[PDB]
Amino acid sequence: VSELAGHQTSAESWGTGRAVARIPRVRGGGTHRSGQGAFGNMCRGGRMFAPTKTWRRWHRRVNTTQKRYAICSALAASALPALVMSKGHRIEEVPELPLVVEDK
Amino acid sequence: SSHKTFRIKRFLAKKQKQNRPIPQWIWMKTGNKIRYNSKRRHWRRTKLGL
């Protein structure tokens, strides 16, 4: 979410008096948005709480030996008969589960 | 102001032509989203700025 979302509007708080809830409201105007409340997460329009940043830690790195261990385990589970059916593959008519075919 | 200038008179002449409403055939088209003229400026309600 962009950082300009919500903070483009200028809104000074009225403060005490005027039986209002002490919220920064839009400075005057003869229009539907006049004394409405711009800033804050709870107000209509404006900004949400905690704008999601572009510099979030999206990517997680894995050790190379752990990656190779994952490859070895994923290949070794493809030889056992029960682990393939528990994935869900219909393998009832396959003649051999280590299915090795010719180079053609 | 009876003592008008030509620029102000032309500016009022364009707004007098903009003051007219919509025709009746314009809401018969396919992709219409216009029910009525929303820019009807009345001479007592909106004082044209200035």
Binding site: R18, G35 | R45
Partner: peptide, 24 residues
């Protein structure tokens, strides 16, 4: 048309009015 604005603050119950003043 014009959206009637927020009712202008009328500085009343403050200090310059001698109608309502507590204990001083």
């Amino acid at each position: 048309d014009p959206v009637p604005y927020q009712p202008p603050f009328l500085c009343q119950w403050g200090r310059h009015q001698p109608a309502w003043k507590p204990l001083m």
